[PDB]
Prior knowledge:
The protein has helices spanning about 85-90, 140-145, 170-175, 195-200; strands at about 5-15, 65-70, 70-80, 95-100, 105-115, 125, 185-190. By secondary structure, the protein is an alpha+beta fold. GO terms for molecular function: cellulase activity; cellulose binding.
Amino acid sequence: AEFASGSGQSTRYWDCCKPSCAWPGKAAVSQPVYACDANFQRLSDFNVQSGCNGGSAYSCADQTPWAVNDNLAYGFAATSIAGGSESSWCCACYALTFTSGPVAGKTMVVQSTSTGGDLGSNQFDIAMPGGGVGIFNGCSSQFGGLPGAQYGGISSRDQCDSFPAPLKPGCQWRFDWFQNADNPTFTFQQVQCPAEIVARSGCKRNDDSSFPVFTPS
């Protein structure tokens, strides 16, 4: 089907790795996702080696989540190879309407900018600094690591104050708008990416007009 839809579950992460959709040739897009140097400054080159494989390119701090209004957030996520190929999902956007936790009934629109190799078919790993470095600790090479559990990350908002400072706003969002929700479930619909999300990643799919225009729900 051309439209992704159904039920799923979210997790959280921030591993500092160059996103998978930041490389050329992954999908029919205007340009790949921007990657950044270790200081979080945008790279103009899309072919710089990932810091997770001994290189110098990392995830950008401006590709972090934020509150759009009381009931709506925008951000970025990793999605599965199990649920489809990178050509079908790199830089696509999805409106997640949460169905569990304190955020139940709220909506988050995420752009898929990366892949997780062992994610469930409709699993979205929502990028949040301090959500957990997981298996690949790119953050160790970027700036010596993040505190928190490998899986699940930090346990209090006040630990965001200790982070590399450009990561602080996205870290705080986890505790503020997201209410420290623990891996909430959702239903989802594919949507045309909001301009404000593309303004940060740089990456718009050639087929994006085929998907619903998103307004506050």
